[PDB]
Amino acid sequence: VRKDPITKEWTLEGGALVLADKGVCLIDEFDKMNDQDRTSIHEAMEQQSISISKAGIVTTLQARCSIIAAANPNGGRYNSTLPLAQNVSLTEPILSR
Amino acid sequence: PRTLTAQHLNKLVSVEGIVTKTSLVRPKLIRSVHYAAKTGRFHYRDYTDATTTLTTRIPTPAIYPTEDTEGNKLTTEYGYSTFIDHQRITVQEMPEMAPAGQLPRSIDVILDDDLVDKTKPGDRVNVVGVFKSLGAGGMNQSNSNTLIGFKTLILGNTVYPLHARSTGVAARQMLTDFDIRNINKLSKKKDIFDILSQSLA
Amino acid sequence: ALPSIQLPVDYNNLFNEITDFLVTFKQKGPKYMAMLQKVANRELNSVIIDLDDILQYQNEKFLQGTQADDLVSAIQQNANHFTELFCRAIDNNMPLPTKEIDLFPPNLTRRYFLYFKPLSQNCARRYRKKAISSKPLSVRQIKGDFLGQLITVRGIITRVSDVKPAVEVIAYTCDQCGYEVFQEVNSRTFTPLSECTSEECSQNQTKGQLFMSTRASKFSAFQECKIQELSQQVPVGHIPRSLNIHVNGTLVRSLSPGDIVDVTGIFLPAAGLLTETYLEAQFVRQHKKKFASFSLTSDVEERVMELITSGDVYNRLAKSIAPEIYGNLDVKKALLLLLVGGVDKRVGDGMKIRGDINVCLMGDPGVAKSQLLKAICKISPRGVYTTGKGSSGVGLTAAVMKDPVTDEMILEGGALVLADNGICCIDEFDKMDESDRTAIHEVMEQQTISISKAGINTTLNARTSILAAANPLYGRYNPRLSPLDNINLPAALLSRFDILFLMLDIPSRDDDEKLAEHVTYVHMHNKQPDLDFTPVEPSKMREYIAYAKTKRPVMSEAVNDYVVQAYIRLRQDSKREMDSKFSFGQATPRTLLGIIRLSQALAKLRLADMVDIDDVEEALRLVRVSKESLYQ
Amino acid sequence: IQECTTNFRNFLFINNTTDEELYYIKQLNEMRELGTSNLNLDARNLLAYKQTEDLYHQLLNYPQEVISIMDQTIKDCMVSLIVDNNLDYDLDEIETKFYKVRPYNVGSCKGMRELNPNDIDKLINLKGLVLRSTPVIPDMKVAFFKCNVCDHTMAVEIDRGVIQEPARCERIDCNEPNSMSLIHNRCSFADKQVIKLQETPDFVPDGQTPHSISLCVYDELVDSCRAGDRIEVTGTFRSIPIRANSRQRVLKSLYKTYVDVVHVKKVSDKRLDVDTSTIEQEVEEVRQITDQDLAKIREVAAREDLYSLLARSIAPSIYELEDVKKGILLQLFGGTNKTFTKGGRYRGDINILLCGDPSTSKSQILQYVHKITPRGVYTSGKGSSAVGLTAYITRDVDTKQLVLESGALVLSDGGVCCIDEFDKMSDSTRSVLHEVMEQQTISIAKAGIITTLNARSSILASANPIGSRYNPNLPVTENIDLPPPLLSRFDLVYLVLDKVDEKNDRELAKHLTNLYLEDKPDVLPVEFLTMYISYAKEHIHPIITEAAKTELVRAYVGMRKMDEKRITATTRQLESMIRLAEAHAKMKLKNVVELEDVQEAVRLIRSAIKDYATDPKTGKIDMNLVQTG
DNA sequence: CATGCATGCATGCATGCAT
DNA sequence: ATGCATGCATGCATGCA
Numbered sequence A: 001v002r003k004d005p006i007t008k009e010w011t012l013e014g015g016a017l018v019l020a021d022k023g024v025c026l027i028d029e030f031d032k033m034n035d036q037d038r039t040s041i042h043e044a045m046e047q048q049s050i051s052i053s054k055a056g057i058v059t060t061l062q063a064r065c066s067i068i069a070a071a072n073p074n075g076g077r078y079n080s081t082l083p084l085a086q087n088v089s090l091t092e093p094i095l096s097r
Numbered sequence B: 001p002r003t004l005t006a007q008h009l010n011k012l013v014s015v016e017g018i019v020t021k022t023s024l025v026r027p028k029l030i031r032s033v034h035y036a037a038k039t040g041r042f043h044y045r046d047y048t049d050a051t052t053t054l055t056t057r058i059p060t061p062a063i064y065p066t067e068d069t070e071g072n073k074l075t076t077e078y079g080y081s082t083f084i085d086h087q088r089i090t091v092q093e094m095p096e097m098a099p100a101g102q103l104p105r106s107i108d109v110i111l112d113d114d115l116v117d118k119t120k121p122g123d124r125v126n127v128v129g130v131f132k133s134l135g136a137g138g139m140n141q142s143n144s145n146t147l148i149g150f151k152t153l154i155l156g157n158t159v160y161p162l163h164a165r166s167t168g169v170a171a172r173q174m175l176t177d178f179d180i181r182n183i184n185k186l187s188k189k190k191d192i193f194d195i196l197s198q199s200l201a
Numbered sequence C: 001a002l003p004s005i006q007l008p009v010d011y012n013n014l015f016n017e018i019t020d021f022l023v024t025f026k027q028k029g030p031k032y033m034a035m036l037q038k039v040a041n042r043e044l045n046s047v048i049i050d051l052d053d054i055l056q057y058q059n060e061k062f063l064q065g066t067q068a069d070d071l072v073s074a075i076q077q078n079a080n081h082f083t084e085l086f087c088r089a090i091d092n093n094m095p096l097p098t099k100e101i102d103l104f105p106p107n108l109t110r111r112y113f114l115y116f117k118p119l120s121q122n123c124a125r126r127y128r129k130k131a132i133s134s135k136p137l138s139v140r141q142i143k144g145d146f147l148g149q150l151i152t153v154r155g156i157i158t159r160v161s162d163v164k165p166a167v168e169v170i171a172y173t174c175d176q177c178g179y180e181v182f183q184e185v186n187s188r189t190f191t192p193l194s195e196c197t198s199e200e201c202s203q204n205q206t207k208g209q210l211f212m213s214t215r216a217s218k219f220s221a222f223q224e225c226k227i228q229e230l231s232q233q234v235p236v237g238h239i240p241r242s243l244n245i246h247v248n249g250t251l252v253r254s255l256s257p258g259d260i261v262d263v264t265g266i267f268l269p270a271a272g273l274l275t276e277t278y279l280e281a282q283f284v285r286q287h288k289k290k291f292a293s294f295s296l297t298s299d300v301e302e303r304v305m306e307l308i309t310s311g312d313v314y315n316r317l318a319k320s321i322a323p324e325i326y327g328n329l330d331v332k333k334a335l336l337l338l339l340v341g342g343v344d345k346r347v348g349d350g351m352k353i354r355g356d357i358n359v360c361l362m363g364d365p366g367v368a369k370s371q372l373l374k375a376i377c378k379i380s381p382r383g384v385y386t387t388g389k390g391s392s393g394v395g396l397t398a399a400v401m402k403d404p405v406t407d408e409m410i411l412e413g414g415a416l417v418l419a420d421n422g423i424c425c426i427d428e429f430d431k432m433d434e435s436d437r438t439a440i441h442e443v444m445e446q447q448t449i450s451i452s453k454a455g456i457n458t459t460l461n462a463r464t465s466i467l468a469a470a471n472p473l474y475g476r477y478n479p480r481l482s483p484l485d486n487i488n489l490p491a492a493l494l495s496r497f498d499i500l501f502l503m504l505d506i507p508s509r510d511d512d513e514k515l516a517e518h519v520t521y522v523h524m525h526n527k528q529p530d531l532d533f534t535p536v537e538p539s540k541m542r543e544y545i546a547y548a549k550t551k552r553p554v555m556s557e558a559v560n561d562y563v564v565q566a567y568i569r570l571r572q573d574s575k576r577e578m579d580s581k582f583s584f585g586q587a588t589p590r591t592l593l594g595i596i597r598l599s600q601a602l603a604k605l606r607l608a609d610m611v612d613i614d615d616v617e618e619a620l621r622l623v624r625v626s627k628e629s630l631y632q
Numbered sequence D: 001i002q003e004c005t006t007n008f009r010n011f012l013f014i015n016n017t018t019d020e021e022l023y024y025i026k027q028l029n030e031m032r033e034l035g036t037s038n039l040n041l042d043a044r045n046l047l048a049y050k051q052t053e054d055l056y057h058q059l060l061n062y063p064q065e066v067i068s069i070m071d072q073t074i075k076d077c078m079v080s081l082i083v084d085n086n087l088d089y090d091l092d093e094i095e096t097k098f099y100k101v102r103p104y105n106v107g108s109c110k111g112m113r114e115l116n117p118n119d120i121d122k123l124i125n126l127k128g129l130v131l132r133s134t135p136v137i138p139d140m141k142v143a144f145f146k147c148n149v150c151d152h153t154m155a156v157e158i159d160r161g162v163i164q165e166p167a168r169c170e171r172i173d174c175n176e177p178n179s180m181s182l183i184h185n186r187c188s189f190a191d192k193q194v195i196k197l198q199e200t201p202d203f204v205p206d207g208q209t210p211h212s213i214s215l216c217v218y219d220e221l222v223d224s225c226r227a228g229d230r231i232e233v234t235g236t237f238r239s240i241p242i243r244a245n246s247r248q249r250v251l252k253s254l255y256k257t258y259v260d261v262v263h264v265k266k267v268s269d270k271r272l273d274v275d276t277s278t279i280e281q282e283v284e285e286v287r288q289i290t291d292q293d294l295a296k297i298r299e300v301a302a303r304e305d306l307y308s309l310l311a312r313s314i315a316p317s318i319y320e321l322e323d324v325k326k327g328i329l330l331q332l333f334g335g336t337n338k339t340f341t342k343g344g345r346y347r348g349d350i351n352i353l354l355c356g357d358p359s360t361s362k363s364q365i366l367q368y369v370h371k372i373t374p375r376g377v378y379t380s381g382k383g384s385s386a387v388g389l390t391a392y393i394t395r396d397v398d399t400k401q402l403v404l405e406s407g408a409l410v411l412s413d414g415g416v417c418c419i420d421e422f423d424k425m426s427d428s429t430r431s432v433l434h435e436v437m438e439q440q441t442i443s444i445a446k447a448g449i450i451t452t453l454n455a456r457s458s459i460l461a462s463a464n465p466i467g468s469r470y471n472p473n474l475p476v477t478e479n480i481d482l483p484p485p486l487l488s489r490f491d492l493v494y495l496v497l498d499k500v501d502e503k504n505d506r507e508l509a510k511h512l513t514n515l516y517l518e519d520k521p522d523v524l525p526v527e528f529l530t531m532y533i534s535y536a537k538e539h540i541h542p543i544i545t546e547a548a549k550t551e552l553v554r555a556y557v558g559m560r561k562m563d564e565k566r567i568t569a570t571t572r573q574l575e576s577m578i579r580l581a582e583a584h585a586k587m588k589l590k591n592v593v594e595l596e597d598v599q600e601a602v603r604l605i606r607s608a609i610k611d612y613a614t615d616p617k618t619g620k621i622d623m624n625l626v627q628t629g
Numbered sequence E: 001c002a003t004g005c006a007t008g009c010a011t012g013c014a015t016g017c018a019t
Numbered sequence F: 001a002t003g004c005a006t007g008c009a010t011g012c013a014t015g016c017a
């Protein structure tokens, strides 16, 4: 819930996942996200919706979109001696969707 | 504060909430005295404002006298004038009652004289007073705006502090003769430390 | 319009009683005539009126039987009006300079400032007249009913401005006709006069332009201050409030931040009917006299003589610090030496050495360390108490701020600048961040601070003495670990202390009974047990220490030879233990300097100009006993 | 007025060489021979002469009028002198110039936070350091008006800050009302500048902070004081009412205060003269030596214990530490400065680091070097920031506009910057020094500013070993707590080790204790030492000869013939050697560096870091091989 | 809205102890 | 010898004027 640069007006802006409903979200550098991004992507990929409770606005928004993501392995080189789950930073709950 | 509407203007109401913002107590001028040395005589002027009385009175041209009718110069006698204390506070809907996730509602209250300092911010309060309206929401002006309304506030005449959990105010009861007699009678028994102790939880 | 009302006052009779008092009262000739003679003769810029004198004068006139008026009551109720009445009388009875020198508003001619002094309480009880001007009041008890009266407020100063000029009577001159116009000013802002108003200019068709003349104007000295409430006055669960003070005339520079004071003044008012308020200062009274204001008046000499001639003064003055705390005699001696201090030294070249003593107390829980820093912060005239947690390093040194009164930008100082020429007692020394203690090093050694952050590139001055309290690494003492590792202060910080006491609590069935009896007596009766020892009151002790601080003993050679031998002995004896790792550190020259300073202070307390050898013996004994608990 | 112009007229180790001549007559003659128009006047010379005893006090109370009286008297005396002797040179050009007098050494002050309102419009003196200086402000003295109906023009003069506007044309033919118009670009203007002055703690009572003042300088004393200089000013105390608004004319009762500058003095006896190499493109900047002082300088230059005497004279109250003193002395002189026009540029400034046990007089030495320097700031390590040392962006409170200010390392240009607690200082607050210690420059690129600033100074740093005490159980490079690239820049690294020894213990104890026998106790005084160093810095620039090149190369390859157990030799040891040898040559007033100076350079480098008493293999100190000596 | 200082909260790294 | 827990020191977020 941000402020508009020109109209001095509040705006409820959903992320790329709520803005890509009935479309596709293309995510680059998928392995270098902070806590907020991981939580948002987890909710989107679990329930295909995003909740929000900010500044008097309590609502839910639809995020029925497909996700295509790109990433790089730990250390910058894939190690075939280990399972894929140990070559990437992503945990299992996000890697099972 | 949430359920106060335009239907209740100009009525005596009682409102409970949380004190959110107090002000700095200040004096207000109510009578101004003067001395004229040339004639050796004392004069006095009186002043009034909207929030002094409940009824409406034609405004008077407040002007501080500087020269006597005969022309003799005047000097102020600050010690013989009259001043009355004045505070303004803000009350809000308690967190224990306000709906979750929605911005709360507020109302201003005006206190004066002997009700000017009896509560502190963050306390639970109950104010009994008259809900009033003041000014002109652009009505007098030929062209001011079409998106404003009249200003409202409460002329407090009673304030009570309420005791809650995890709150600053401390509970208190009025003890009667019966209560004191019973306490004194009960304190005689030898097992008192056990009676008062097994009764906890 | 403007009706009239009748009052019992009479501003004619009172002016006559004013003149009678002012030229007929005696405690030598008339009392106030002499003061006016000094004013004429150019030796006095201030005249002060004691209301006790007025009260006594009117009581004597009542004894005479002739009816009079209650002048003091009239002044107490309406005090801003009597200032000019007194000034008028003082301008009609002034003498002519017996010595030699080398219409217009009356204030240009006056060169003196009138101040009223409140009415004492003892005089009131003497003459049965309850005094309203000498009743201290909190900043929260001053309400509208007091506007216009003469009152007193007790508090602690927080902020003070810089003296500035304020114009009371602007003067002008006309180049066309040559007249002089005078404008009086009694507001924060003003509009100047523009065109000439004389008879000639009025008659003529060419009116001249006026010009301000700075030299002829009546410029006064203005300062402003802020005063808060003491924590003993705030109600249960509230926050203290503040109040403003104006100072004009020859009272400027009489209030400094951090000083607990009683200030007397007139409570005067400042689009609405609401109004701001302020106190016009008339008389200040400090609760603890500054040491650097001492004079050997006859009374103070009489008082100090009794202490001098009463035998033991070192033990009497050491047993009198916190007389409700049992034992700890050596600790109290080293803390009494903390107050006096050594003797600073400038070698004439670009070098200087401090003269203050820093002390540290490290001990076990429940040995009354804190309750001795709270008594030392109270005996000292400019004491400060801080706790390790509640501190920031900056909060101790300084930061920036802006002055509301003037427009200058100013630098605000922390607790170590408020304690200048005083004790800065730091509690919980170990628990404050090590990145916050490192700002204390320069203060301890060079007695300065050096700020090089944005906006400010400068230095301060902090002539402070540090009394620190701390605890071992893990609560209680661990005899197994080394003494050095048990404590948690680096060697550099340890060297900067001169006394470091170890108050370990070792139970023993015999001595605990004495402590128990002392404490439980302190509780059953609200005073200390001993009926043979009568502790010196804080005022008499402060007065003696102030007299002692004026000396500057020097040393002979017969003591220098002893000092050198002892230093060699200690510095050789220390290496064995330090290598053995059961030690406290390694002796350095700072140990020698500390011994010298302790000897100087012991010499000063004796009122001597030379350092005896029994002083270097007491100093060495103290530095030895400092660690005589680890060798239990 | 007649009494003043007469009294001043007639006014205008005992020795008799030049003390029996008319002091001001020669000045008046040199002034008319050279075309100068100022005659600095020492006030005490006025107090001395019997006749001008009242005039002194009058000047102390009525400066603005007495100054004009003196100026007119000096002009009249010049005219009388030229006419009386029938001198050949013309007396026409003199009438086309103006003359002034700049009194100084007026009765001392007490502190600007103790002056009362009854001191307004009086002469005073202050001493402080400069922080900021506004650009040139054009002030008006004459106004130019033109007639927009007849094209006639007028010139009006100013009077106490007001201009009078002609209400009617002054021509008879044309007298149209309110027809005049001001033409800004045809008017006349003078210069003005405003400077911030921070007073030194000459005296400050208990608990007060520093106080900053504003000074105004007019006409010819504009852009004469830079930021960082320490000066003594003499001028008038003034007051002014300030307008509360740019539209409304309601004045504020509380008055502002400032000082009008009439004289500024820069040089001081108890410090060196500013380096002359940094003001080449830029008021007595430097002290002037007579031939009698130069004679003493030359005589001292030929003593057999010059290098010992000079070192021992610095900080006379410190005991021994002869090598530390020698290094600091060579620091002050510095190496010769070179100017390239095909390559880059190199400068000789010597940085020194002092590491050692507590209580070894590391702070006292830095305080001495601070007080015997022209420019420099003594800042500890704790109270500093990366910006507070280099430069900041700020807003004035008497304008409300933007400006870049100068930090600690810029206020010390041409001098020495002293830094205590070099170890208890942040790793990022310390990186800004990387550019300032080899490039002698400060590149800034922040919002609205992109520039590079010269900061050409030397560093004197004091640091404690990790764990406070120094234990010879670890390598030397581990007791210190600095990384490689920062520790290579320092030219000298000094180890100050404590050692228990009854002999030195007794000697130092007797030294320290000799200061407490009295309350106020071969060493050349301070002023002569400063004069010597200033002359040497300004005049002698030694050159390198082939005999020394072969020694420098050999000694450096020798240090390189010798992992990470100690400070490995880099290419900056060779340059350190060159600079130290040049400084040693400069001390003796020679103009050629020879073998005996390169040898001193190498000896001092090796002695600094206790190399004669260290094991080359394990790299740890042998406490038995270190002696005070 | 950018600059730079002081408070307070959060995180990640290192060291010590226990299994 | 390895892993886990605790304490400390470095970083960021806020808040500011």
Ligand SMILES: Nc1ncnc2c1ncn2[C@@H]1O[C@H](COP(=O)(O)OP(=O)(O)O)[C@@H](O)[C@H]1O
Residues within 6 Å of the ligand: C324, C325, C326, C327, C364, C365, C366, C367, C368, C369, C370, C371, C372, C515, C519
């Ligand atoms: N020697 C003693 N004499 C009197 N009271 C003591 C003594 N030792 C301890 N006490 C009491 O025990 C308490 C210790 O509190 P405190 O000063 O906080 O101890 P510490 O600061 O050492 O932890 C005090 O209230 C004091 O009354």
Ligand SMILES: Nc1ncnc2c1ncn2[C@@H]1O[C@H](COP(=O)(O)OP(=O)(O)O)[C@@H](O)[C@H]1O
Residues within 6 Å of the ligand: C353, C445, C589, C590, C593, D317, D318, D319, D320, D321, D357, D358, D359, D360, D361, D362, D363, D364, D508, D512
């Ligand atoms: N060689 C010495 N010459 C003179 N004074 C010394 C010497 N060594 C120690 N001192 C004393 O040590 C004190 C200064 O110590 P200081 O320099 O502050 O320690 P540090 O070097 O750790 O900062 C002075 O009071 C001085 O008298």
Ligand SMILES: [Mg+2]
Residues within 6 Å of the ligand: C369, C370
């Ligand atoms: Mg405690």
Ligand SMILES: [Mg+2]
Residues within 6 Å of the ligand: C445, D362, D363, D420
């Ligand atoms: Mg030091």
Ligand SMILES: [Zn+2]
Residues within 6 Å of the ligand: C174, C175, C176, C177, C178, C179, C196, C197, C198, C201, C207, C208, C209
């Ligand atoms: Zn006139």
Ligand SMILES: [Zn+2]
Residues within 6 Å of the ligand: D147, D149, D150, D151, D152, D169, D170, D171, D174, D175, D176, D179
């Ligand atoms: Zn014309």
